[model samples]
Target: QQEENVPYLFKSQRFQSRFRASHGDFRILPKFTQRSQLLRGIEKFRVSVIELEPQSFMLPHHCDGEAIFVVVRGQGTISIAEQDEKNSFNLERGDVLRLHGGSTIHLLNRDNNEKFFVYVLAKSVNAPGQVQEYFSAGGENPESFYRAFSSDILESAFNTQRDRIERLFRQQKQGAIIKASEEQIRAISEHASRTQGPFNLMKERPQFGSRFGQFIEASPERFEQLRDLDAAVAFMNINQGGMVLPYYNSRSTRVVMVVEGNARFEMACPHLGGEVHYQKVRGNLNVGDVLVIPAGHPITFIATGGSNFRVVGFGINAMFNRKNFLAGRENIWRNIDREAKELSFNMPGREVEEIFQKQDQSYFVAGPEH
Candidate 1:
């Protein structure tokens, strides 16, 4: 039981490499808590980071679950293959995509000099906190799905000799991610046209804005495809010395991944045991670090280091969620009964009211001077 109590501040090192090859590796975030516990707030989904070296290919594969991904860096192309269908699209930094469940996809980084990076938030189909990829293209080295059939059935289906099928099934020792030949590169690259995606977060208008920071979010309201997943994504860029107001999501559990720079995050956990009114989930976060904020928990983060902070948040149950801030003029406390405020704070009404009224800013504001 003790081992299952994982930290809310999930460090980058905790991500397990689900698959690796010379060209790239796929890393999946580990469970935040035991599978059977209520502490695993985002139990219905998992996040993964995929990176590919230049001039390489990610072999065709299909997942049993659905996924949403953000292109973190570099340029690449992804082909979604269905029965008699191959929908290919170009992927660039800041692009968002929704891959339906049971879709087969292949990806390639044709760029000669840049490494490609992507972060995927996938919904678990079979069970809580799990997703399996059944690679459709492979051989004896990785074991293709075709190899599962009996040779007699395969020969009859393809009308081919056993030797031919044997050779085909035994070829290609390279891992799931492999370097593509120049001809293969050009051929696959040409397929990168007529897309299913886009939803560029960087180009979209900010949902919330201030001098210190800006919040960009894509929900079902903006990206209709997300309605099917019942999820949304939010991107935030906080300038050095800027921070977000302490806030909570009414119905969503946020899976927060720091994309760049440094920040300090804090969450108020009210489910602690006796003698403790609140438990703190607070720490400094660097690039690639993640934190899960359960629904209705007060959370805040500040850009503390020399550079600006950028983060991507995947919101579970996004359609009906509302962000309720604890501070700022938009806070719910702003309209509380005058005497109730005094009783709540154990102070005179005017004193508490003045403290609350001092901050006229809304969602984003400048951090402490020190």
Candidate 2:
């Protein structure tokens, strides 16, 4: 299929909105391939943004694909269950979580005043753009999946009366995103406070030393258990007036979501035809915006506001494993034979060298003044 020159940025909130059974608002971005033919080859992912009011929650549910969530706002608690053991974590701005396919999970906004926002990057392990949710427990808004079972079967399975089973499963009418009651909020807050430990990324120190900003790559060894669920994830804090240098992954497509503050994002792609035809797609990203960068696309992030800017991104696979920086010291141009580079650029070898050597900084660089 021929590709159209479509923009790579997808503003999720521009689409139709719906309130979840739990009363949280959500919007699903259109399929990436649907927006640009260049992304046709990368149809294994989808993006969505969900907002839960303070003291709201989503019941246990499972999806058809794996998802990595970026906390965009406020504090919350995520409850994940694997096999028989359940684990809960306190999540704050910049936190990331990988929820594997078919894993039962629950989310709650424990804060009493602020809304909890999440940007979800889901990788399809099954049908493309088909991340279906099978809710084991939803209020009246979304009937529980178990309700499909015959009353007699459910009653026998639970070792309870049919009427009791119906009442238990069907009584609550609050949607999937329901407002948490006062007691529920207090309980969740207590649990989140009590479970505070080193496992919480919010409390852990972030890795630094990037040329432009602080970065915390979710290394599998540090987050050993998460490796089984996700391929790669990272939390980034771009210093005010800083920018991430242009780079592209050789293998993994990435979904970058802004967690806080404003930022400028752009993608530059080489034209399939011309000698030096490069087209750049640019956009302004606010909190809750999700940008999908297809594999091989050169992309850069710039913090715009005069405050700390933060974002979290998920890669389809090990994102940093094969990253090739287009700019900086270790860039491909630096490694290429001078003669070959000069020939390709139609410039003198000295000029080529000067171009590559102009910017010595790698990774994060200071952004242009506003």
Candidate 3:
């Protein structure tokens, strides 16, 4: 009965013109529910294809889940709004709109009569099984949100609003700026590859910084790779028995898409002055499976067996060892805590010492402090 039991999840694009309303765009596959129960628990990380009608519009607001829209076919306008200003760009095939979570924004199908198609991915759904379409009457268009950043509006708006405008520009500038040595840039790509090592190979210690330790599951030899690292993704080799790694860091969250084999993940939170306590759950993970492990928990990934096993693991905020990691200390803690509480999991504590010890210092001082 489950569609996931079938090998493929994609509906043929040739069927796109099949579903249509009188006024809006035509949608052949508006909602392709996850065929695989394996994709459960991580609603925000879900993927799907959707089509919008010409001259149509989506609500002007923000989503709690981070989202991305890929223009698969056709042309349209993609508008994004930050706290202060607004930007609308022409979008055609191959263009993608990358959006942040918790930012107020919206989209418009600017084409007069052509349908716009897109593929989307979100961090997690706001409500389980609910696809929300948020809007505001004043939020009729992205322009309304842009007004706050307009030079003309800032010149005439209230002084407080003006200050907000100035603040917005300042923040944008900060994010838009990034400078790194060529070696450093190369190192980052190398680190990404190291962290996202091949599926069949033993879990390799990543060259980048780590966000949490419990997110890893490695054998003794692989464990050696992460002994001094911050974030890494490791799993038991296919032929070897399933293994789990202990947690020793703060703010660990994970999204695992199983390409092969099965796994069971047990999660725990550190409590009562360092007692390791866990809330356990056991389930079957199969090929094409996806699991979202909450933060602030002791997560143990066990390979269920009688046979060879495998799976591809993905995650959020999982960094490798970095001296400046503790710079944005509070924000990192808050991020982990929020995801954990929302998903109802415990937080592990390998990095508790670092959290307390580096609480007041910027990451610039992390090397010296640690």
State which candidate has the highest TM-score: 1
Each prediction's TM-score versus the true structure = 0.92, 0.80, 0.32
Candidate 1 has an lDDT of 0.84
Query: How accurate locally is residue 197 in candidate 1, as Cα lDDT from 0 to 100?
Result: 66
lDDT for model 2, please: 0.72
lDDT of each: 0.84, 0.72, 0.42
lDDT, candidate 2, 1-370, per-residue tens = 1112345666646444644444677677677777567666557777777788888888778888777776767878887766866667788876666666788878888777998887787777777767777889863557788888999999999999999987888776767788788888667556553111223365556554365686666655456545654456767788888987788878777677777788887777674323676676777888766777777788888899677678777766562456677887667787789899889989998888988999878777889886
Residue 158, model 1: lDDT of 86
Give one digit per residue, the lDDT tens place, for model 3 in 216-301. Answer: 24222243423332223433233325343333234444544453456555444332114555434445566544445555544444
- Better-scoring candidate (TM-score), 1 or 3: 1
Which lDDT tens digits does candidate 1 get at residues 1-370?
3322435667888788876588998998865554335556667688889898999999898887789979988988898988767788889988899998888899999999999999899987897767888877888646688889889988998899977986798897888899987789889879576226667878767877788888988887778888888889889899899999999999988888988899888788877414657777678888998888888889888999598899899998898788888998879898798899999999999999899989989888998775
lDDT score at residue 310, model 1, on the 0-100 scale: 93
TM-score of 3: 0.32
Candidate 3, backbone clash total: 24
Off by over 4 Å in 3: 1-4, 7-36, 40-43, 125-131, 138-370
The clash count of every prediction, one per candidate, is: 0, 10, 24
Q: Which ten residues in a row have the lowest lDDT in candidate 1?
A: 1-10
